[PDB]
Amino acid sequence: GLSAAQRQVIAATWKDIAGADNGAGVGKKCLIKFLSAHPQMAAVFGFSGASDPGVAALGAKVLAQIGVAVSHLGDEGKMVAQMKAVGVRHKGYGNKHIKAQYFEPLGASLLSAMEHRIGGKMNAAAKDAWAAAYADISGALISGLQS
Ligand code: HEM
């Protein structure tokens, strides 16, 4: 769960992170860079590499889904349930077992791509709030994946 201060920062910065493409450029940057830093993850996702066009496509879906969890930050129960259902869907995805450990480096790639877009707006309070929101969102997905 997020405190009211954290929910406020997430909601405000999400408007700039979504920009004029519902965050699709952030999603492409996040996944391209994650696969370039961790080449082994391409096999998990079933991609040929960081330049496979499926990376842009999936990066956009991931970001749109984050925007849906942000719209429910006012009702944590709804956000958690929604993310658990996405997690359950992941039981049928990829070519390699999806491990909880993979989520941490993806979080780092996501926060760096958000900063690359919003610059100075990603201050101390935004980094703290987005780390806690990613922990909540990823943690709920993992609970569904492992159910
Ligand atoms: C390292 C962690 C992850 C891996 C390996 C992974 C893997 C995948 C794969 C292989 C697919 C589907 C491609 C196909 O349809 O065959 C997928 C789809 C998707 N992933 Fe992930 N995923 C991860 C993390 C996440 C996160 C953190 C989110 C959201 C916050 C997310 C949300 C989605 C969504 C929205 C889709 C599209 C399909 C659907 O809505 O069920 N994933 N993921």
Curated annotation (Swiss-Prot):
Annotated heme b binding sites: H90
Gene Ontology MF annotations: heme binding; metal ion binding; oxygen binding; oxygen carrier activity
Additional comment: X-ray crystallographic analysis indicates that the D helix is absent, Leu-58 replaces the distal His (of myoglobin E7), His-90 binds covalently to the heme iron, the F helix has several more residues than in mammalian globins, and Pro-105 (G7) causes a bend in the G helix.
Source domain of life: Eukaryota
Keyword Lyase: no
Coiled coil stretches, renumbered: none
Assembly behavior: Monomer.
UniProt keyword terms in alphabetical order: Heme, Iron, Metal-binding, Oxygen transport, Transport
Site positions per UniProt: Causes a bend in the G helix: P105
PROSITE patterns in the cross-refs: GLOBIN (PS01033)
Keyword hit for Heme: yes
Residue span, Globin domain: 1-146
Protein name: Globin, major monomeric component
UniProt lineage: Eukaryota, Metazoa, Spiralia, Lophotrochozoa, Annelida
CDD domains: Mb-like
Any Pfam family: Globin
Similarity field: Belongs to the globin family.
UniProt organism field: Glycera dibranchiata (Bloodworm)
